């Protein structure tokens, strides 16, 4: 997509995540599991709901009485009504089709954007304490327990605490050990 995350470096979605639109999967020695990011999921749901509602609510409907009230000696006037009725059908059809096409492209890019923002927030926190895999995952160079994982999820991840332990691990892989 535009932001390169969905179907980009993040290959495919997660059938196993059911509690939200975007979020995290973790794996350590205690176990593994999915956790949904409620903030971005709720904002995206509200935005998408507003989009559909805006496309519907902004329409203006007024009473009209459409019939065929002209006789055999008034064909010219009926032709005027036909040219008018077909004119509005062409206008509404083209606008409705293209609006759907354009809005769907933006909606998919909106989801792609939301995922990339979540990814970038994690990357800035972890820095070199974890390795970017290029697939949407980060391999920690230190032990990250269930409480450490939540710190990454909610923004309070402490880089200096693990900076040492991470640094020693970087050397071991570097030296072919």
């Amino acid at each position: 997509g535009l932001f390169g995350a969905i179907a980009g470096f993040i290959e495919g979605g997660w059938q196993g995540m059911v509690d939200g639109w975007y979020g995290y999967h973790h794996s350590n020695e205690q176990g593994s599991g999915y956790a949904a990011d409620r903030e971005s999921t709720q904002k995206a749901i509200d935005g998408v709901t507003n989009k559909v509602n805006s496309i519907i609510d902004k329409m203006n409907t007024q009473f009209e009485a459409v019939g065929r009230e002209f006789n055999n000696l008034e064909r010219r006037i009926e032709n005027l009504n036909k040219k008018m009725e077909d004119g509005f059908l062409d206008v509404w059809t083209y606008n409705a089709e293209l609006l759907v096409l354009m809005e769907n492209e933006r909606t998919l890019d909106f989801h792609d954007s939301n995922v990339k923002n979540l990814y970038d927030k994690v990357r800035l926190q972890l820095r070199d304490n974890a390795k970017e895999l290029g697939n949407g995952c980060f391999e920690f160079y230190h032990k990250c327990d269930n409480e450490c994982m939540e710190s990454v999820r909610n923004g309070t991840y402490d880089y200096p605490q693990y900076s040492e332990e991470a640094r020693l691990k970087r050397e071991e892989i570097s030296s072919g050990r």
Binding site: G1, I6, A7, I10, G13, W14, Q15, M17, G20, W21, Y22, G23, Y24, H25, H26, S27, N28, E29, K51, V52, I55, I56, M59, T61, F63, E64, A65, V66, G67, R68, E69, E74, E85, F88, L89, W92, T93, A96, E97, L98, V100, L101, N104, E105, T107, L108, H111, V115, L118, Y119, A130, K131, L133, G136, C137, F138, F140, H142, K143, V152
Partner: protein, 321 residues
């Protein structure tokens, strides 16, 4: 190995597909259609007001009282008129109703309608009022329009009619009258005794003078004669004035009329459905808040915009895999 955290997005088993400007047939987790394709398939009230359904009659036959027509009862108010595409009982006696289309538009939506007797047949003591034709049968027996009177010579005499009616009611009156076109001088004398004849009608605004055209015409409903009918709207406290020495089709019943809104005539073969709607089509009523529909162009009511489309599907979820 090593501890890992990943970023990802939802996926489900949905097979809904949407189109975008750059991509076609993209599977998404959720989608919503903004096109309305469903109708209840019944004729409904328009905002709680029942339509006027003229089953086997046209508007002209219903107004003039065709003998094969008034299976109806009193409908004092309606929101629109349902006419069948080709009604059967239009004008038993061949002829025309002047300004028929504008009159139909006027009657499409009526706030109050009530047939009222204005000129009883006793008001023609020196004229025959039992004018009857076989082209206007009632149960096989020849009859005539129920709301107008065919005036015929009596005692070999057609005295010049100089009569008037004054609208004493508080509402507008729709009044219809007509002139009979004869076929030859013999028939003209046999019916009215006056070879040269006229029908003059006057109101505060109307100023009309009609003379019959006595000529040979092609048979319609087994008849070569014609009856041309005309109408007017008589304001309250106004009076209509009739002068005729033959060929007059006098009014007997009129209609109190009150108009507060406008509608059209709907061509449909369906029947009343005992339902309410905001938007009606000839093939069914629609209950929708969607901005677009593809059901039918000939709509009456507050309706979504008509489009030539099968689907307008908005992606509301994520791209699926």
């Amino acid at each position: 190995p090593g501890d890992q955290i990943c970023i990802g997005y939802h996926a489900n088993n949905s097979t809904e597909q949407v189109d975008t400007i750059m991509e076609k047939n993209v599977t998404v987790t959720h989608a919503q259609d903004i096109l309305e394709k469903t109708h209840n398939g019944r004729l409904c009230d328009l905002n709680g007001v029942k339509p006027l359904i003229l089953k086997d009659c046209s508007v002209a036959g219903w107004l003039l009282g065709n003998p094969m027509c008034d299976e109806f009862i009193r409908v004092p108010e309606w929101s629109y008129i349902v006419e069948r595409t080709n009604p059967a009982n239009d004008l038993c006696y061949p002829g025309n109703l002047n300004d028929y289309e504008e009159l139909k538009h006027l009657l499409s939506r009526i706030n109050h309608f009530e047939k009222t007797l204005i000129i009883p047949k006793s008001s023609w003591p020196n004229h025959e009022t039992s004018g009857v034709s076989a082209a206007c049968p009632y149960q096989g027996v020849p009859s005539f329009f129920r709301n107008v009177v065919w005036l015929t010579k009596k005692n070999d005499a057609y005295p010049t009619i100089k009569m008037s009616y004054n609208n004493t009611n508080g509402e507008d009156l729709l009044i219809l009258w007509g002139i009979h076109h004869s076929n030859n001088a013999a028939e003209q004398i046999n019916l009215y005794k006056n070879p040269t004849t006229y029908v003059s009608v006057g109101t505060s605004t109307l100023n009309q003078r009609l003379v019959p055209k006595i000529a040979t015409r092609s048979q319609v409903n087994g008849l070569q004669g014609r009856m041309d009918f005309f109408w007017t709207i008589l304001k309250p406290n106004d009076a209509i004035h009739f002068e005729s020495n033959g060929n007059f089709i006098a009014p007997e019943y009129a209609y109190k009329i009150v108009k507060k809104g406008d509608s059209t005539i709907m061509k449909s073969e369906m029947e009343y459905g005992h339902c309410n709607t905001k938007c009606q089509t000839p093939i069914g009523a629609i209950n929708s808040s969607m901005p677009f529909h593809n059901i039918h162009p000939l709509t009456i009511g507050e309706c979504p915009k008509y489009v030539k489309s099968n689907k307008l599907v908005l992606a509301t979820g994520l791209r699926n895999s």
